[PDB]
Design a protein around this ligand. Structure first.
Ligand SMILES: [Zn+2]
Ligand SMILES: [Zn+2]
Lengths: 443, 69, 107, 106, 56, 65, 134, 286, 57, 167, 51, 57
RNA sequence: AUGCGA
């Protein structure tokens, strides 16, 4: 009597399956990290991860070259396109189109038919004209997004075993996978750097970036509420210079860290010094490297005298690449860059908090350089977290809606660059443009 | 799938002894050992045949596509 | 085996040369010779280096506090006179060249 | 051995201000106090100006709401403290040179 | 003190053969001056190229 | 303020141009306008040292146990 | 300026008897800074066990507390004025705050003692005899 | 990268690993591991920390390896002494296992990193966000469950069983050491009696085993299925065989085995079956 | 394969008459060579044999 | 596979001696006086100095390894052929290794005596940066087991802390 | 972006038409099968299944 | 005991005649294509080792 | 090409 057979209990469960709660709650809890992950893209805080993502993509502005005959360099042609909400519907199929009675579509059907198990993806498009002169809402259907089984978007999410058997399913079907063309696929979980925490790494690639690079460096993987990531690296140059690495359009970019410091918040050099060394006034090692950093920045850019000028230099120097154009001034492009690159885990208006953390990363980097602390291990489980398949889903969706809006803007650019036949105000134009880009993101 | 007809190792027909064995575990509140002793499965090849069985057919049969549900 | 057969590399990773020592060669003589051939870097004898940079030229007072004379004399079989010759001839010339190189780095 | 408390003053009077290491300001520099009577508590704001710069300081409301600063003056001989609630204000100093900008584009 | 190409001379325990000293570097010409302790006729090395250049 | 070999503007906290390089007997801040090469002049010195790592050796190993 | 309309001007201040019992370097007076969780009502105190020097544990509404006192951070016996924890002294309800001092030396003053009220916690010991059953 | 690290204890299985190229790359979560899918109560944590003696980062004005940095999700909220670092970490763990601090979710991960000579850089890095790997262990001071993540575990003394609890050292104990094994590794009986790589080849065989894939097979249309009809429940099993219900999907059969070289066809890796047994349907599959 | 990762192909389908029979009147289902265990150290399989035998009886 | 009551008596009695071996070697490589307390603060600081150095840690591993391997050699040489519950012929497990049909005296000692010291890339168990080789081990544990020496055997099983090292 | 290979790519690398179809080839009159033991055949023979 | 899905017994294949790739006229690939097993480079080396040059041809 | 059997 230690592992006794559950014989009558089992055979009873085989003959008369549970009608209220599956047994073996570990069996459902084992795939909980998948299903739960997919539920967080449709329900949760604010509206779920996906609605935060579309709230973070913001706007895509385009100016029809508002002729008007400031009206010749201020155009007077603003078109702000965005996405307010994103809705996902449970699988349905209506035949002959509309004029039919709709039926719920079950996984058994997708498997028997050897087809995907799609849910209609809808997203509330916002067509804002002249910054507010005219607002247009449109719910656009973006094709069938494959829904995860037993998730908050599959009909089997809440079915009792008895109902599950009544729907031709494995009385215990865990789910968490996708029926795509009838083939069951799951998204493999991945081990990625632990978010939001500076990891001190010595890497010979860091020396491989070029001259004056040391091995030492800091890597923080900032992840936004919507779970999209942005890796930020600090490098200690052999010269004492510290450079800040980031990646945009999967291209890498280096900026002096003292620039992102003077750019985040208005401060004195003595405020950065106190931020870094503090009470530690006795580190000749750190006092001198920091004198090289601050004095060196004062050397390169003697005319960046205040934070605003610095912001203008960053927006002005990246305006060609952040695709924000005349639609923004170099101050706006600069601040939008800061908010979009530097420690995005701290969020908008976290620029003092981003300042404090960035100084903490510089200090950690000098503690690594001196050798007063050990380096961390990227491959230790200590320093790692798990990218859940559903989260990859939300990130790739966010990117697809960003591209979809980029495609609208491209379509307006082509139409206006070959005809300029019609104004941003026409509802006809909304239907026409929307009908000329491809919106089947489900496919 | 379904209670085997015979014990693989020995050869004694066992397929007749399933339902009574299950009755003996329910109705008589017996224990699996004594139930198998009263069934005459006095060898472990036989003992294990019925003792370990998993009559999965009851789970299969609820999937019968030839009747409305 | 790859380092030999595959590449015939003229740069072994661990190049060694075996030296047979005469039957007459004492074990103590052998340890003396082992010290006598091994390289001794200047770093290997330095205990502490204090640089007091004062700046109205930019003054660098470089203080090299070595081990005890007998300490490096019993680990590396070298004298204070050899330290004089090496510092006064080699070390300074190389550091002064590196400082000039750092001026080029400045400009 | 414990120090006794003599008096407590609960209404705004004295303030405390964080600055750069070296702040000294003119022999006459003046500090404007503000009181944004917001619901339960009054988040404060300090503002001053000088011949070149202007210094503005404010409270970290999310840390202010979870911790509150008190300053008192003790006499060893009278064993008495005059207690004063004082806001700690993280102040930044902008100059006249810090108020110039470039064109809105290249 | 540096003999070109030679780093360290160590005193490993003798085994299955004559007493020897194993150096961590290869420089025959330099051991040629040390003949009063080393039977030069019995020098050997793991460096094939250096042997080819010196001993043929 | 002077720290180590850095001297910050006393009024504005800017790391003002080093007194050693001014073209006057009195420099000023690039943020404010304070007088310094003229006032107190500093005697900038740092006792810099080795990290007690650059110099591995058997003798250091005999100093570590 | 008088910005964020959500703010009001000041109208009520109180004189600071900085010198009614001060004497230049002769009165050993002190000013202290103490950090108080909002959960405590300072006005409901009567004395302060700051005199405990280090063992400044304190009990406020049957709650047990520890008062951390530190010299560091701003009273270091190392540098001249290691603090940016400026004292801003008023004068009248119709005057703006002033930099603390003890005479007209354009020199800021520090807090003689800095204290911090820290919330204590039960942290009960492990019952080894109950847990380590074989 | 493939080296099995001790950090993975309780999070990744030490035996659920493929054999070949992927070895060490394709880990498997422990049967008791969880993944955070939300984030909570980060907003109330600053208030309690401030009450516990954390100096506000605007007010602290100090930074260094000489001081503990309290951070929440990579938001530096304050600074304290390393001593107060440890007092905060432990009293915080007490308020976590207690039920009196609703701004403090049980599943918060409290990363304490003590001061260490050339060690990991000190601090009190709390984490509450998603994708954290979290596992239950039994907290002894309240004899109640506590969720620990892989970051804090490194510096935590978790006794493996109650009788090995060392005085004044282990602050938690495993609920069961099976919590460090994956599902299939627990399904393997007496897995602690075999050479490790034989247990790993056991995971690959049982994982490659022809069994019962489902029971709705008349309503699937796989390119291939292998379904054993004569399936049985092991006499010898882990209790997780019942707790995970694997008896719903039996993958084998109980055979009378003689460990005997006798026939001359059982060498190295080859085994003999009874003919009459196969004729009676033994291991019969479709 | 057993639950011990000791996999083997069936070399032959031995006649029941040719199998060895115990004094209990049975002939085994499977015969595994003993010399496989000394390299693998699959002694968990030995214990599973003696536990399944006890538990069947 | 069984030993006698005698063979288990010798096996357990010899295996009682590794408890000194762990710290005794830790204080040899640390270069501190004999019987130095397992909780001397200087011992812990010296051992952290060793942890931060890969070479010094290599010396500590190699010396602890040689000593506990000397305990293994003792255990097998005492038990094994003399202490088995049934001998030679009467013992097929010994027969296969000794004839060399299959197995080795190493395998036979791993079943009947002890597993012994696990190694990786040529040395003892990895240690976390906290100074711990497993969560259950206090930082810098000088116990031989904490380095990965498994006293348990396949015939009587291995403790879970030991299963993680043999894994 | 995945440009159709030319004759230089067709001839070289792992394949090298020379390596994949010249230095080694598929062959006729050949079979592949899982091997099974048998002590009753000669040590110089191979038991061929009647297929 | 568990039955592995890999009945590699069934994976046997023999080809004495079949299709050939048009670019080589050599046996096509794959069991299901009735393709022919590869005599690889190492098997070529081995046949040269044996002196079996008429077998290698 | 991915996974995988030997
Ligand atoms: Zn039978
Ligand atoms: Zn200035």
């Amino acid at each position: 009597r230690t592992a006794d057979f559950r014989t009558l209990e089992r055979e009873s469960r085989f003959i008369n399956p549970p009608k209220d709660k599956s047994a073996f709650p570990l069996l459902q809890e084992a795939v909980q990290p998948h299903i739960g992950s997919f539920n967080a893209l449709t329900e949760g805080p604010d509206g779920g991860l996906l609605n935060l993502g579309v709230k973070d993509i913001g706007e895509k502005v385009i100016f029809d070259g508002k002729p008007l005959n400031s009206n010749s360099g201020y155009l007077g042609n603003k078109l702000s396109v965005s996405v307010e909400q994103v809705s996902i519907a449970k699988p349905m199929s209506n035949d002959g189109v509309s004029s039919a009675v709709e039926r719920k579509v079950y996984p058994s059907e997708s498997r028997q038919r050897l087809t995907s198990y799609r849910g209609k993806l809808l997203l509330k498009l916002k067509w804002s004209v002249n910054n507010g002169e005219e607002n247009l809402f449109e719910v656009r259907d973006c094709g069938g997004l494959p829904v995860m089984l037993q998730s908050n978007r599959c009909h089997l999410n809440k079915m009792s075993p008895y109902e599950l058997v009544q729907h031709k399913e494995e009385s215990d079907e865990i789910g968490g996978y996708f029926i795509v063309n009838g083939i069951e696929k799951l998204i493999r979980m991945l081990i990625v750097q632990r978010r939001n925490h500076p990891m001190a790494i010595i890497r010979p690639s860091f020396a491989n970036r070029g001259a004056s690079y040391s091995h030492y460096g800091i890597q923080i993987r900032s992840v936004r509420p919507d779970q999209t990531s942005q890796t930020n690296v600090l490098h200690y140059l052999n010269d004492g210079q510290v450079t800040f690495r980031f990646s945009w359009r999967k291209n890498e970019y280096l900026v002096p860290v003292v620039m992102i410091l003077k750019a985040l918040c208005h401060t004195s050099d003595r405020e950065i010094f106190d931020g870094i060394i503090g009470n530690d006034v006795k580190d000749s090692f750190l006092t001198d490297r920091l004198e090289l950093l601050l004095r060196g920045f004062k050397k390169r850019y003697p005319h960046l005298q205040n934070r605003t000028q610095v912001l203008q230099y960053l927006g002005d120097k990246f305006r060609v690449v952040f695709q924000a154009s005349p639609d923004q001034s170099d101050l706006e492009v600069g601040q939008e860059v800061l908010d979009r690159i530097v420690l995005v885990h701290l969020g908008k208006d976290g620029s003092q908090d981003k300042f404090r953390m960035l100084l903490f990363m510089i200090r950690k980097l000098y503690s690594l350089v001196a050798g007063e602390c050990s380096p961390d291990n990227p491959d230790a489980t200590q320093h790692q977290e798990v990218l859940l398949g559903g989260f990859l889903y939300g990130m790739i969706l966010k990117e697809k809606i960003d591209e979809y809006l980029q495609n609208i803007i491209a379509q307006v650019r082509m139409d206006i660059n070959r005809g300029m036949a019609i104004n941003f105000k026409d509802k006809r134009y909304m239907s026409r443009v929307l009908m000329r880009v491809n919106e089947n993101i489900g496919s | 799938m379904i209670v085997p007809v015979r014990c693989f190792s020995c050869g004694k027909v066992v397929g007749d002894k399933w339902e009574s064995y299950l009755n003996l575990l329910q109705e008589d509140e017996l224990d699996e050992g004594t139930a198998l002793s009263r069934l005459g499965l006095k060898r472990y090849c036989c003992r294990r045949m019925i003792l370990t069985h998993v009559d999965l057919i009851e789970k299969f049969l609820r999937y019968n596509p030839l009747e409305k549900r | 085996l790859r380092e030999i057969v595959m590449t015939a590399s003229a740069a072994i990773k661990t190049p060694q040369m075996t030296l047979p020592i005469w039957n007459d060669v004492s074990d103590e003589q052998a340890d003396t010779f082992c010290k006598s051939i091994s390289k001794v870097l200047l770093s290997e004898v330095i205990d502490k280096v204090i640089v007091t940079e004062t700046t109205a030229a930019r003054s660098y007072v470089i203080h090299m506090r070595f081990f005890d004379n007998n300490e490096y004399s019993e680990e590396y079989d070298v004298s204070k006179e050899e330290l004089q010759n090496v510092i006064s001839n080699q070390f300074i010339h190389l550091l002064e060249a590196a400082i000039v190189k750092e001026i080029k780095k400045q400009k | 051995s414990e120090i006794e408390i003599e008096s407590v003053q609960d209404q705004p009077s004295v303030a405390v201000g964080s600055f750069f290491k070296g702040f000294r300001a003119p022999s006459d520099t003046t500090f404007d106090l503000y009181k944004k009577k917001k619901s339960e508590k009054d988040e404060f704001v300090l503002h001053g100006e000088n011949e070149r710069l202007e210094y503005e300081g404010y409270t970290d409301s999310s840390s202010q709401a979870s911790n509150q600063y008190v300053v008192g003056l003790f006499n060893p001989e009278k064993k008495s403290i005059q207690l004063y609630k004082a806001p700690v204000l993280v102040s930044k100093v902008v100059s006249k040179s810090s108020k110039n900008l470039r064109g809105p584009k290249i | 003190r540096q003999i070109p190409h030679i780093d360290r001379c160590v005193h490993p325990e003798p085994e299955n053969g004559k007493r020897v000293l194993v150096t961590e570097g290869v420089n025959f010409q330099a051991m040629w001056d040390q003949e009063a302790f080393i039977d030069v006729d019995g020098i050997t090395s793991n460096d094939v190229a250096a042997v080819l250049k010196t001993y043929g | 303020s002077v720290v180590g070999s850095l001297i910050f503007c006393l009024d504005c906290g800017d790391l003002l141009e080093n007194p050693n390089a001014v073209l006057g007997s009195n420099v000023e801040c690039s943020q404010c306008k304070a007088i310094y090469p003229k006032s107190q002049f500093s005697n900038l010195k740092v006792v810099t040292t080795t990290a007690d790592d650059a110099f591995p050796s058997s003798l250091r190993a005999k100093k570590s146990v | 300026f008088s910005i964020p309309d959500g703010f009001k001007k000041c109208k009520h201040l109180k004189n600071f008897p900085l010198n009614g019992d001060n004497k230049k370097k002769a009165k050993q007076q002190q000013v202290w800074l103490i950090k108080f969780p909002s959960n405590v009502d300072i006005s409901k105190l009567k004395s302060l066990p700051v005199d405990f020097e280090s063992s400044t544990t304190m009990t406020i509404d049957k709650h047990d507390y520890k008062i951390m006192d530190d010299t560091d951070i701003e009273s270091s016996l190392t540098q001249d004025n290691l603090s940016n924890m400026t004292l801003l002294v008023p004068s009248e309800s119709k005057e703006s705050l002033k930099i603390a001092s003890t005479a007209k030396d354009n020199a800021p003053l520090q807090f003689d003692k800095v204290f911090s009220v820290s919330e204590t916690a039960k942290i009960p010991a492990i019952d080894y005899s109950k847990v380590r059953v074989p | 990268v493939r080296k099995l690290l001790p950090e993975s204890w309780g999070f990744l299985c030490p035996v659920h690993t493929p054999d070949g190229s992927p070895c060490g790359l394709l880990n498997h979560f422990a049967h008791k591991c969880r993944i955070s899918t939300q984030q909570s109560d980060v907003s109330r944590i600053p208030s309690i920390l401030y009450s516990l003696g954390v100096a506000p980062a605007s007010h602290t004005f100090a930074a260094g390896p000489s001081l503990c940095c309290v951070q929440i999700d990579g938001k530096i909220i304050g600074w304290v002494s390393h001593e107060q670092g440890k007092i905060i970490a432990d009293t915080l763990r007490y308020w976590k296992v207690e039920g009196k601090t609703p701004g403090l979710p049980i599943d918060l991960e409290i990363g304490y990193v003590p001061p260490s000579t050339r060690g990991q850089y000190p601090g009190l890095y709390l984490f509450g966000g998603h994708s954290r790997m979290l596992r239950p262990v039994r907290y002894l001071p309240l004899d109640k469950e506590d969720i620990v993540g892989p970051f804090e575990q490194v510096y935590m003394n978790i006794a493996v069983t109650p009788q090995e609890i060392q005085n004044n050292v282990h602050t938690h104990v495993e609920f069961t050491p099976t919590n460090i094994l994956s599902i299939l590794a627990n399904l393997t009986p007496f897995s602690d009696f075999n050479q490790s790589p034989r247990n790993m080849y056991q995971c690959q065989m049982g994982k490659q085993t022809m069994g019962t894939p489902g029971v709705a097979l008349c309503h699937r249309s796989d390119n291939k299925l292998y379904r054993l009809q004569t399936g049985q429940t092991p006499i010898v099993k882990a209790n997780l065989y019942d707790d995970y219900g694997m008896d719903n999907f039996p993958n084998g059969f109980n055979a009378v085995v003689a460990v005997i070289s006798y026939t001359g066809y059982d060498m190295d890796d080859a085994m003999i079956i009874n003919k009459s047994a196969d004729e009676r349907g033994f291991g019969y599959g479709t | 394969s057993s639950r011990h990762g000791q996999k083997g192909v069936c070399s032959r389908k031995w006649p029941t008459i040719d199998m060895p029979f115990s004094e209990t009147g049975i002939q085994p289902d499977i015969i595994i060579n003993p010399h496989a265990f000394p390299s693998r150290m699959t002694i968990g399989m030995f214990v599973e044999s003696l536990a399944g035998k006890a538990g069947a009886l | 596979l069984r030993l006698t009551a005698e063979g288990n008596k010798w096996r357990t009695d010899i295996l009682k001696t590794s408890v000194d071996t762990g710290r005794e070697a830790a204080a040899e490589v640390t270069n501190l006086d004999k019987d130095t307390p397992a909780d001397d603060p200087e011992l812990l600081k010296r051992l952290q100095e060793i942890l931060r150095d890969n070479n010094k840690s290599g010396i500590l591993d190699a010396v602890t390894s040689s000593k506990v391997n000397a305990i293994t050699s003792q255990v097998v040489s005492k038990c094994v052929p003399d202490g088995t519950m049934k001998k030679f012929p009467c013992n097929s497990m010994q027969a296969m290794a000794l004839s060399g049909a299959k197995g080795s005296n190493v395998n036979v000692s791993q079943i009947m005596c002890l597993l012994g010291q696990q190694a990786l890339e040529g040395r003892r168990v990895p240690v976390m940066v906290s100074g711990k080789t497993l969560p259950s081990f206090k930082p810098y544990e000088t116990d031989a087991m904490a380095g990965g020496y498994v006293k348990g055997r396949f015939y009587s099983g291995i403790k879970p802390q030991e299963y993680y090292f043999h894994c | 972006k995945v440009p159709i290979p030319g004759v230089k790519q067709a001839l070289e690398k792992k394949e090298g038409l020379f390596r994949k179809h010249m230095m080694g080839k598929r062959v006729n009159y050949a079979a592949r099968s899982v091997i099974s033991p048998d002590p009753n055949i000669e040590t110089n023979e191979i038991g061929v299944p009647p297929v | 005991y568990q039955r592995l899905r890999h009945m590699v017994n069934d994976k046997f294949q023999v080809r004495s005649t079949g299709p050939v790739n048009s670019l080589t006229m050599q046996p096509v690939k794959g069991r299901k294509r009735h393709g022919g097993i590869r005599v690889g480079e190492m098997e070529r080396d081995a046949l040269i080792g044996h002196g079996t040059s008429f077998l290698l041809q």
